[PDB]
Protein backbone atom coordinates (compact mmCIF):
# COMPACT_ATOMS: atom_id res chain seq x y z
CA UNK A 1 0.00 0.00 0.00
CA UNK A 2 2.78 2.45 0.88
CA UNK A 3 4.83 1.71 -2.23
CA UNK A 4 1.85 1.98 -4.62
CA UNK A 5 0.56 5.50 -3.82
CA UNK A 6 1.35 7.94 -6.70
CA UNK A 7 2.44 11.44 -5.57
CA UNK A 8 5.38 13.87 -6.03
CA UNK A 9 7.65 11.48 -4.05
CA UNK A 10 9.33 8.16 -5.10
CA UNK A 11 8.86 5.83 -2.12
CA UNK A 12 11.44 3.07 -1.79
CA UNK A 13 11.18 0.32 0.83
CA UNK A 14 13.68 -2.54 1.13
CA UNK A 15 12.07 -5.92 0.19
CA UNK A 16 10.74 -7.79 3.27
CA UNK A 17 12.48 -10.97 4.50
CA UNK A 18 10.54 -14.11 3.61
CA UNK A 19 9.99 -14.83 7.32
CA UNK A 20 9.04 -11.29 8.42
CA UNK A 21 6.23 -10.94 5.82
CA UNK A 22 3.25 -12.34 7.92
CA UNK A 23 4.03 -10.09 10.99
CA UNK A 24 0.79 -8.28 12.00
CA UNK A 25 0.39 -4.62 12.94
CA UNK A 26 -2.34 -2.04 13.53
CA UNK A 27 -2.91 0.99 11.29
CA UNK A 28 -6.12 2.89 12.01
CA UNK A 29 -7.41 5.10 9.20
CA UNK A 30 -10.42 7.30 9.88
CA UNK A 31 -13.45 6.94 7.60
CA UNK A 32 -15.48 10.14 7.87
CA UNK A 33 -16.61 12.80 5.41
CA UNK A 34 -15.23 16.30 5.98
CA UNK A 35 -17.49 18.07 3.47
CA UNK A 36 -20.24 18.87 5.99
CA UNK A 37 -18.17 21.52 7.81
CA UNK A 38 -17.75 23.67 4.68
CA UNK A 39 -21.40 24.68 4.31
CA UNK A 40 -22.70 28.25 4.46
CA UNK A 41 -23.12 29.33 8.08
CA UNK A 42 -24.34 32.48 9.85
CA UNK A 43 -20.96 32.60 11.63
CA UNK A 44 -18.71 32.15 8.60
CA UNK A 45 -17.31 35.66 9.04
CA UNK A 46 -16.14 34.64 12.52
CA UNK A 47 -14.39 31.59 11.05
CA UNK A 48 -12.62 33.76 8.47
CA UNK A 49 -11.55 36.37 11.01
CA UNK A 50 -10.24 33.92 13.58
Amino acid sequence: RITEMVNDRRIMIQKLTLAEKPQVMRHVTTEINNDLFFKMSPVAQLYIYH
Binding site: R1, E31, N33, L36
Partner: protein
Protein backbone atom coordinates in the same frame (compact mmCIF):
# COMPACT_ATOMS: atom_id res chain seq x y z
CA UNK B 1 -20.38 -13.56 -28.70
CA UNK B 2 -17.34 -15.83 -29.00
CA UNK B 3 -15.25 -16.62 -25.93
CA UNK B 4 -13.37 -19.49 -24.29
CA UNK B 5 -13.36 -20.31 -20.57
CA UNK B 6 -10.36 -22.05 -19.02
CA UNK B 7 -10.29 -24.35 -15.99
CA UNK B 8 -8.98 -21.66 -13.62
CA UNK B 9 -12.25 -19.73 -13.94
CA UNK B 10 -13.56 -20.56 -10.42
CA UNK B 11 -10.40 -19.25 -8.74
CA UNK B 12 -10.49 -16.02 -10.75
CA UNK B 13 -14.24 -15.72 -10.16
CA UNK B 14 -13.97 -15.97 -6.37
CA UNK B 15 -11.58 -13.00 -6.30
CA UNK B 16 -13.74 -11.09 -8.77
CA UNK B 17 -16.91 -11.66 -6.74
CA UNK B 18 -15.15 -10.61 -3.53
CA UNK B 19 -13.96 -7.41 -5.22
CA UNK B 20 -17.46 -6.69 -6.53
CA UNK B 21 -18.98 -7.23 -3.08
CA UNK B 22 -16.41 -4.95 -1.44
CA UNK B 23 -17.04 -2.20 -4.00
CA UNK B 24 -20.81 -2.48 -3.52
CA UNK B 25 -20.47 -2.26 0.27
CA UNK B 26 -18.13 0.75 -0.10
CA UNK B 27 -20.67 2.48 -2.38
CA UNK B 28 -23.58 1.89 0.00
CA UNK B 29 -21.58 3.08 3.01
CA UNK B 30 -20.50 6.26 1.22
CA UNK B 31 -24.10 6.71 0.05
CA UNK B 32 -25.67 6.59 3.51
CA UNK B 33 -23.36 9.34 4.83
CA UNK B 34 -23.69 11.81 1.94
CA UNK B 35 -24.66 15.26 3.17
CA UNK B 36 -26.09 17.50 0.47
CA UNK B 37 -23.63 20.26 -0.30
CA UNK B 38 -21.50 21.99 -2.89
CA UNK B 39 -19.70 18.77 -3.85
CA UNK B 40 -21.83 16.52 -6.04
CA UNK B 41 -22.39 12.85 -5.30
CA UNK B 42 -20.25 11.71 -8.24
CA UNK B 43 -17.31 13.76 -6.94
CA UNK B 44 -18.01 12.56 -3.40
CA UNK B 45 -17.86 8.89 -4.50
CA UNK B 46 -14.68 9.35 -6.59
CA UNK B 47 -12.72 10.78 -3.64
CA UNK B 48 -13.34 8.09 -0.93
CA UNK B 49 -15.44 5.37 -2.65
CA UNK B 50 -12.80 3.64 -4.77
CA UNK B 51 -10.22 3.12 -2.03
CA UNK B 52 -10.60 -0.60 -1.31
CA UNK B 53 -7.69 -2.82 -0.29
CA UNK B 54 -7.33 -6.60 -0.29
CA UNK B 55 -4.94 -9.30 -1.45
CA UNK B 56 -3.66 -8.51 -4.93
CA UNK B 57 -5.51 -5.29 -5.77
CA UNK B 58 -4.09 -2.09 -4.29
CA UNK B 59 -5.85 0.79 -6.06
CA UNK B 60 -7.50 3.88 -4.56
CA UNK B 61 -9.46 5.17 -7.56
CA UNK B 62 -12.62 3.95 -9.32
CA UNK B 63 -10.46 3.61 -12.44
CA UNK B 64 -8.26 1.22 -10.47
CA UNK B 65 -11.08 -1.15 -9.58
CA UNK B 66 -12.45 -0.80 -13.12
CA UNK B 67 -9.09 -1.98 -14.48
CA UNK B 68 -9.02 -4.78 -11.90
CA UNK B 69 -12.41 -5.92 -13.19
CA UNK B 70 -11.07 -5.74 -16.75
CA UNK B 71 -8.02 -7.84 -15.85
CA UNK B 72 -10.05 -10.50 -14.04
CA UNK B 73 -12.64 -10.70 -16.82
CA UNK B 74 -10.00 -11.08 -19.53
CA UNK B 75 -8.07 -13.68 -17.53
CA UNK B 76 -11.21 -15.71 -16.83
CA UNK B 77 -13.45 -15.55 -19.91
CA UNK B 78 -11.30 -14.46 -22.88
CA UNK B 79 -7.80 -15.88 -22.36
CA UNK B 80 -7.31 -19.20 -24.11
CA UNK B 81 -5.56 -21.62 -21.68
CA UNK B 82 -3.80 -20.38 -18.50
CA UNK B 83 -1.91 -23.52 -17.39
CA UNK B 84 -1.63 -27.37 -17.92
CA UNK B 85 -4.86 -28.88 -16.46
CA UNK B 86 -3.22 -30.88 -13.60
CA UNK B 87 -1.86 -27.64 -12.00
CA UNK B 88 -5.49 -26.46 -11.47
CA UNK B 89 -6.90 -29.83 -10.30
CA UNK B 90 -4.28 -30.11 -7.52
CA UNK B 91 -5.25 -26.68 -6.01
CA UNK B 92 -6.08 -27.07 -2.27
CA UNK B 93 -7.39 -23.51 -1.53
CA UNK B 94 -11.23 -23.60 -1.22
CA UNK B 95 -13.92 -21.09 -2.26
CA UNK B 96 -17.28 -19.88 -0.92
CA UNK B 97 -20.66 -20.90 -2.38
CA UNK B 98 -22.42 -18.12 -4.31
CA UNK B 99 -26.02 -17.05 -3.65
CA UNK B 100 -28.79 -19.06 -5.25
CA UNK B 101 -30.18 -18.03 -8.61
CA UNK B 102 -33.33 -15.89 -8.54
CA UNK B 103 -33.97 -15.04 -12.20
CA UNK B 104 -37.52 -16.00 -13.26
CA UNK B 105 -37.79 -18.34 -16.24
CA UNK B 106 -39.90 -16.52 -18.83
CA UNK B 107 -38.37 -17.38 -22.23
CA UNK B 108 -37.39 -20.97 -21.47
CA UNK B 109 -35.09 -22.46 -24.10
CA UNK B 110 -36.23 -25.72 -25.71
CA UNK B 111 -35.38 -27.60 -28.94
CA UNK B 112 -37.83 -29.54 -31.20
CA UNK B 113 -37.14 -33.12 -32.50
CA UNK B 114 -35.48 -33.69 -35.94
CA UNK B 115 -38.85 -34.84 -37.42
CA UNK B 116 -40.33 -31.30 -37.64
CA UNK B 117 -43.77 -32.73 -36.70
CA UNK B 118 -44.48 -29.78 -34.33
CA UNK B 119 -44.35 -25.92 -34.41
CA UNK B 120 -43.12 -23.96 -31.33
CA UNK B 121 -44.49 -20.55 -30.13
CA UNK B 122 -43.43 -18.92 -26.82
CA UNK B 123 -45.37 -16.94 -24.13
CA UNK B 124 -44.63 -15.92 -20.51
CA UNK B 125 -43.17 -19.04 -18.82
CA UNK B 126 -45.22 -21.16 -21.26
CA UNK B 127 -44.32 -23.35 -24.30
CA UNK B 128 -47.22 -24.35 -26.65
CA UNK B 129 -46.70 -26.49 -29.78
CA UNK B 130 -49.07 -27.70 -32.49
CA UNK B 131 -48.98 -30.93 -34.49
CA UNK B 132 -48.72 -30.80 -38.27
CA UNK B 133 -49.54 -34.52 -38.53
CA UNK B 134 -50.84 -37.35 -36.34
CA UNK B 135 -48.33 -38.68 -33.81
CA UNK B 136 -48.56 -41.53 -31.32
CA UNK B 137 -48.90 -40.89 -27.60
CA UNK B 138 -45.85 -41.33 -25.40
CA UNK B 139 -42.95 -39.70 -27.26
CA UNK B 140 -40.74 -36.67 -26.74
CA UNK B 141 -42.03 -33.42 -28.25
CA UNK B 142 -39.78 -30.93 -26.45
CA UNK B 143 -36.75 -30.99 -24.17
CA UNK B 144 -35.26 -28.13 -22.15
CA UNK B 145 -31.66 -27.12 -22.80
CA UNK B 146 -31.41 -24.26 -20.29
CA UNK B 147 -31.49 -25.67 -16.73
CA UNK B 148 -34.71 -24.85 -14.81
CA UNK B 149 -35.93 -25.60 -11.22
CA UNK B 150 -39.43 -25.04 -9.75
CA UNK B 151 -43.11 -25.96 -9.80
CA UNK B 152 -45.19 -26.98 -12.83
CA UNK B 153 -48.67 -25.63 -13.61
CA UNK B 154 -51.23 -25.85 -16.41
CA UNK B 155 -50.16 -28.91 -18.39
CA UNK B 156 -52.63 -29.97 -21.10
CA UNK B 157 -52.37 -33.09 -23.28
CA UNK B 158 -48.83 -33.69 -21.99
CA UNK B 159 -47.10 -35.29 -19.02
CA UNK B 160 -44.02 -34.22 -17.06
CA UNK B 161 -42.14 -35.96 -14.26
CA UNK B 162 -43.22 -34.23 -11.05
CA UNK B 163 -44.14 -35.18 -7.49
CA UNK B 164 -46.27 -32.86 -5.38
CA UNK B 165 -46.26 -30.24 -8.13
CA UNK B 166 -42.45 -29.90 -8.08
CA UNK B 167 -40.27 -30.94 -11.01
CA UNK B 168 -37.93 -33.87 -10.37
CA UNK B 169 -35.27 -33.32 -13.04
CA UNK B 170 -33.47 -30.10 -13.96
CA UNK B 171 -34.01 -30.73 -17.70
CA UNK B 172 -37.66 -31.79 -18.02
CA UNK B 173 -38.84 -33.51 -21.19
CA UNK B 174 -42.40 -33.10 -22.46
CA UNK B 175 -44.08 -36.25 -23.77
CA UNK B 176 -47.52 -36.92 -25.22
CA UNK B 177 -50.06 -38.58 -22.92
CA UNK B 178 -53.10 -39.24 -25.14
CA UNK B 179 -53.37 -39.97 -28.89
CA UNK B 180 -54.20 -36.80 -30.79
CA UNK B 181 -55.10 -35.78 -34.35
CA UNK B 182 -53.35 -33.09 -36.36
CA UNK B 183 -53.63 -29.35 -35.59
CA UNK B 184 -53.99 -29.97 -31.85
CA UNK B 185 -52.20 -28.03 -29.10
CA UNK B 186 -50.26 -29.10 -26.00
CA UNK B 187 -49.19 -26.54 -23.40
CA UNK B 188 -46.83 -26.48 -20.43
CA UNK B 189 -46.57 -23.56 -18.00
CA UNK B 190 -43.83 -23.25 -15.38
CA UNK B 191 -43.42 -21.34 -12.12
CA UNK B 192 -39.67 -21.87 -12.03
CA UNK B 193 -36.25 -20.22 -11.74
CA UNK B 194 -33.45 -20.28 -14.33
CA UNK B 195 -29.74 -19.48 -14.19
CA UNK B 196 -29.08 -15.82 -13.40
CA UNK B 197 -30.19 -13.10 -11.02
CA UNK B 198 -33.30 -11.07 -11.75
CA UNK B 199 -32.45 -7.89 -9.87
CA UNK B 200 -30.18 -5.15 -11.19
CA UNK B 201 -31.04 -5.61 -14.86
CA UNK B 202 -30.80 -1.86 -15.54
CA UNK B 203 -27.14 -1.85 -14.48
CA UNK B 204 -26.37 -4.90 -16.64
CA UNK B 205 -27.60 -3.14 -19.79
CA UNK B 206 -25.18 -0.23 -19.35
CA UNK B 207 -22.29 -2.33 -18.03
CA UNK B 208 -22.34 -4.78 -20.91
CA UNK B 209 -21.78 -1.87 -23.30
CA UNK B 210 -18.89 -0.62 -21.15
CA UNK B 211 -17.12 -3.98 -21.19
CA UNK B 212 -18.00 -4.51 -24.87
CA UNK B 213 -16.34 -1.25 -25.90
CA UNK B 214 -13.06 -2.73 -24.63
CA UNK B 215 -13.39 -6.32 -25.90
CA UNK B 216 -15.11 -5.30 -29.12
CA UNK B 217 -14.09 -8.39 -31.09
CA UNK B 218 -15.33 -10.83 -28.44
CA UNK B 219 -18.23 -9.23 -26.53
CA UNK B 220 -21.24 -7.44 -28.01
CA UNK B 221 -24.24 -5.78 -26.34
CA UNK B 222 -27.17 -8.15 -25.88
CA UNK B 223 -29.91 -9.10 -23.44
CA UNK B 224 -29.17 -10.60 -20.04
CA UNK B 225 -30.99 -13.84 -20.88
CA UNK B 226 -29.02 -14.40 -24.09
CA UNK B 227 -25.75 -13.45 -22.34
CA UNK B 228 -26.35 -16.00 -19.56
CA UNK B 229 -27.40 -18.73 -22.00
CA UNK B 230 -24.27 -18.24 -24.10
CA UNK B 231 -22.03 -18.17 -21.02
CA UNK B 232 -23.59 -21.40 -19.76
CA UNK B 233 -23.24 -23.06 -23.17
CA UNK B 234 -19.57 -22.01 -23.39
CA UNK B 235 -18.60 -23.59 -20.05
CA UNK B 236 -16.06 -26.44 -20.15
CA UNK B 237 -17.56 -29.91 -20.32
CA UNK B 238 -15.91 -31.27 -17.15
CA UNK B 239 -16.82 -29.06 -14.20
CA UNK B 240 -18.71 -29.59 -10.97
CA UNK B 241 -22.00 -27.79 -10.35
CA UNK B 242 -20.32 -25.92 -7.48
CA UNK B 243 -17.69 -24.26 -9.69
CA UNK B 244 -20.05 -23.34 -12.54
CA UNK B 245 -22.19 -21.42 -10.05
CA UNK B 246 -19.23 -19.25 -9.02
CA UNK B 247 -18.21 -18.75 -12.65
CA UNK B 248 -21.70 -17.61 -13.62
CA UNK B 249 -22.01 -15.38 -10.56
CA UNK B 250 -18.83 -13.53 -11.53
CA UNK B 251 -19.85 -13.45 -15.20
CA UNK B 252 -23.07 -11.65 -14.31
CA UNK B 253 -21.66 -9.56 -11.45
CA UNK B 254 -18.95 -7.91 -13.55
CA UNK B 255 -21.37 -6.01 -15.88
CA UNK B 256 -23.70 -4.98 -13.06
CA UNK B 257 -20.80 -3.58 -11.02
CA UNK B 258 -19.46 -1.80 -14.10
CA UNK B 259 -22.87 -0.22 -14.66
CA UNK B 260 -23.33 0.53 -10.96
CA UNK B 261 -20.08 2.49 -10.85
CA UNK B 262 -21.57 4.67 -13.62
CA UNK B 263 -25.10 5.21 -12.25
CA UNK B 264 -24.51 5.74 -8.55
CA UNK B 265 -27.60 3.85 -7.40
CA UNK B 266 -27.83 0.95 -4.98
CA UNK B 267 -26.42 -2.50 -5.54
CA UNK B 268 -28.49 -5.70 -5.78
CA UNK B 269 -28.58 -8.13 -2.89
CA UNK B 270 -26.94 -10.97 -4.83
CA UNK B 271 -23.90 -8.76 -5.49
CA UNK B 272 -23.82 -7.09 -2.07
CA UNK B 273 -24.41 -10.19 0.08
CA UNK B 274 -21.82 -12.50 -1.41
Amino acid sequence: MNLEINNFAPAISSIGSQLCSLSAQKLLTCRKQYGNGAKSFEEFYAEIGGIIGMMGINSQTPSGIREAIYRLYQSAFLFGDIFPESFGIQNTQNIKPPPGFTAPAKKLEVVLPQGGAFDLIYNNGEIRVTTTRNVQAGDLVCTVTFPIQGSVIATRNCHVNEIGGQLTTTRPEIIASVPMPARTVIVASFDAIEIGYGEGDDLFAIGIAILSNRFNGQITPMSRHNYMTQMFANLPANMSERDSSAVLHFAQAAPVVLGMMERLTGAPKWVLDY
